[PDB]
Amino acid sequence: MKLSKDTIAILKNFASINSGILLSQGKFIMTRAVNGTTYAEANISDEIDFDVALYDLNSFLSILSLVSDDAEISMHTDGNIKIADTRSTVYWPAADKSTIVFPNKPIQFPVASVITEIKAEDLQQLLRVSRGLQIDTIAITNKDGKIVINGYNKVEDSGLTRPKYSLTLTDYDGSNNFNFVINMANMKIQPGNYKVMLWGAGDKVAAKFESSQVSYVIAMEADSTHDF
């Protein structure tokens, strides 16, 4: 088995959503935050040739940087991980599934109620800002034929009535009305251009961010409102 910079990147992201993770034979990876809010999945170029669980995904990936690029990763005679370098060998502990949290099956997102998109640059500005202005919540909504994102600080403004940031996305040719609230703490999306799919059905609200690499599924707050 081998892991390229690209794969190592997406995994490092996944590390921030969950410290651990369970790799399963194939060219598909997925994960989900322990608090059960975020779900991440992606298709990679590298083929995973053995099933193993990592307790500390981030630390493992950092050790990879300390060895060759073609280093071979494999299951060792003792059950742990063997990273074969050129003149050396690095060993890493194989975790016991019970000591980490992971999805049993991927998430099947429903057909979106609303579809829009957000460009790499806007997404980055959104995140950068939010930390500066202490934006703990954002609300995606339709205003005058357009989709905009309004950022608030729910602690002080529980009614999401006083916006600190405001980004205009795409046109909305629909005829519904909605105010989808997402907690910024769950926005652990890696940079890139994403297709945004918001879904509403009664109390059930969830958003799906999808790029050519990764896909994230995020549960939306109860504050949300929509007439779908």
């Binding site: 608090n35 809010t37 099956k105 599924v217």
Partner: peptide
């Protein structure tokens, strides 16, 4: 009120 995917999905 806790936003949780387990309130909508099977995984």
């Amino acid at each position: 009120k806790k936003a949780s995917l387990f309130d909508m999905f099977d995984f």
